[PDB]
Amino acid sequence: GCHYTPFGLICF
Numbered sequence: 001g002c003h004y005t006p007f008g009l010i011c012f
Contacts, residue, residue, distance in 0.1 A: 002011035 002009055
């Protein structure tokens with residue numbers, strides 16, 4: 001469950 005963010009990909 002990761003998401004592509006403008007600051008950096010994050011997973012939780």
